[PDB]
Amino acid sequence: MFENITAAPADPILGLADLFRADERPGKINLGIGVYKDETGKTPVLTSVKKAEQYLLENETTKNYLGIDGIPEFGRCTQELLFGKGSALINDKRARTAQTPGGTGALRVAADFLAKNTSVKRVWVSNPSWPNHKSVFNSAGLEVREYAYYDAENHTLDFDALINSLNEAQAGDVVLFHGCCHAPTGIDPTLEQWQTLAQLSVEKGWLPLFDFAYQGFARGLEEDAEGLRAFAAMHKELIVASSYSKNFGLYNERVGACTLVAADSETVDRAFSQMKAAIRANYSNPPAHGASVVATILSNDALRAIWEQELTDMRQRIQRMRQLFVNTLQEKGANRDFSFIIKQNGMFSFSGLTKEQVLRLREEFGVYAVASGLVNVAGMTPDNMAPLCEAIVAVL
Amino acid sequence: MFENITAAPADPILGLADLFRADERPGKINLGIGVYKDETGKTPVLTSVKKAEQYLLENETTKNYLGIDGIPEFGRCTQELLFGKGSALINDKRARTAQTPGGTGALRVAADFLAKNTSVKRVWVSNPSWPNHKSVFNSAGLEVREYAYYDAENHTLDFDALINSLNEAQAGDVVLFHGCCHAPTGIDPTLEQWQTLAQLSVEKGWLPLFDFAYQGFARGLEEDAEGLRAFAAMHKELIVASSYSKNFGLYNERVGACTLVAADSETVDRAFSQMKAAIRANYSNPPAHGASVVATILSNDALRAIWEQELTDMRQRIQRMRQLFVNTLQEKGANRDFSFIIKQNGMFSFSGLTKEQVLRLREEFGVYAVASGLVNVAGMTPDNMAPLCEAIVAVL
């Protein structure tokens, strides 16, 4: 069967990474990275997870299969993180969490459950969005449509265009929202905008699916959950796909969760059984190690205190690199109003550079960025900031 | 959307497990377990993996994402295990391995790749087979058909019925073969039968998909690969889905692999790119920990020597429990010819018990078995053997 199979393309970041390692120049900077890096250009394993891992090694007596939905405590812990510690959704037991292989894994079991157990045909995604979204929904045969979001020339959330695009969505469509640190723009709705979106959502009958991969990177753990909780307060049903890859630095251990909320415990158990059938037909039951680390940190006060502090250190490093970028550019002098960088949250932002400007940034300076001018702020350090900003001033 | 979603059923083993833990009787025996247990009724973590895990904890500096296909050394190591250390398929680089979440994960990415990149509509599965097979192929929309395999009244491989069922398969269909320790019968083709199957396979144009979950449990690592290598010697293309859950006791770490073989390196790279697109749209990239443990054991002589010995200890425990079962039954006296138990390989066999006999075995004695009379030999110990066999003699 494989003699005229056509080749699949290479995803942008992969391609850039190759071109970067093959770049003989020494002062090269890779801003198209997709992962967090600290002030020394490394993605370390957190001290809290090394300690949780030491512990698991001394206490694990079996590697026997976890249940389809993973470890119960992991479920407890992401529900409290997501919905707040004394939430009505938790006390009325309207929610069920399945441990998945990362946030992508969570999005695919949601897509498979939806495609086979309900009537969704369409999923609405922001323009732009995190790239892999369309492939995940399309593999499940659920059609993807885009709503407007980003105002290119103004570097802002075009809320009017947003609510006006979404009026073409009809009752029974899924609308996907990024919970905080919108990938790739870094522009998030304000809390009032989240509440008018929540109200509009119930009124037109949308099924909200939240992709929550950056909790803790915009303001803090509870602050970042504000919009999701504005929705959960008004919706009988919702799905939230969360990831622990970035806030726990556990990228390759594949730890995420898919949480189903329904009107009552009875209907969420019935729906959840079909979500478990979907997992059973995909990877059977989930990888214990990364989720086990997350569950022992979150349930222990000492370990969780260390983790929270390590996460604010990440958040604050990103926040001073956004500051430093604007300042060193303004100091190196050109016609900047890169001020919008300061108002965006998370590791990503569109710089406003044109694709031929990023092309001579690679060719002439060795600064590597995605052709759309997307830049990962975590690739900037105090040491590479002045070479970076000089290169940007030279191509402007 | 979830208000009239119907409930999914509960998979047999799960149901039996519940009924077993809720059984107040103390001398209860659960033979419907699906996992290996040692002479003390436990599924321990192997000493070789504890040592590999100690090592990973002291040497890992990052949890950054693995490539879509996982860690390269893991790929090296399963290809040599599968095809033999100096294989032509390895030197001509006709094979590509993707690290997957367990053997089930490997079967689903194969199904997704096949469904979307080639013309298979059908997958042939043995009657009977490991239950989850049909759900995996059906989730990918690939129709499943059954070929005859087991001779119920004779407790044997009905080879004639097998080749005669498979003549209804046409060129371009997938035929799934269990590499060794056929689940659930424990009946395997002889090497000559594997070679006539291999010859028939090329002649009618079947695409062979091997499910290899028990390498090392029938005779030894190389012996068990004999049939797959009989096929690989004659086929231009084949897919093998392997699991390390049972032979490394790494069930919940989800470590398996999907290996693609094509006629030349050029066509396997092109086909493999589309298999990577399939993984990218499912869980993105694979869980590092279990695969990392497997790669450091298999590449280190000292650790691999300890592992091989731990695996033969498992294989031999199962082999003396089959012996002991037949002997204690023959000693407890009824009209046994349970001799076929000795000739079956792996942890599973059909006992020949009727469903009402297994029903009074639970009700009256607390011996728990799957309603089809399937029994897991690893649930027998020298200590529970005489209570078990007495109960079986009483219901015969």
Ligand SMILES: *Cc1c(COP(=O)(O)O)cnc(C)c1O
């Ligand atoms: C990182 C990310 C994911 C994927 O999470 P993984 O755990 O890495 O698979 C999903 N959605 C968004 C917006 C993300 O940034």
Ligand SMILES: *Cc1c(COP(=O)(O)O)cnc(C)c1O
């Ligand atoms: C155990 C098994 C699998 C599944 O392997 P996992 O790694 O547990 O998902 C697949 N096929 C057969 C025949 C098996 O026995």
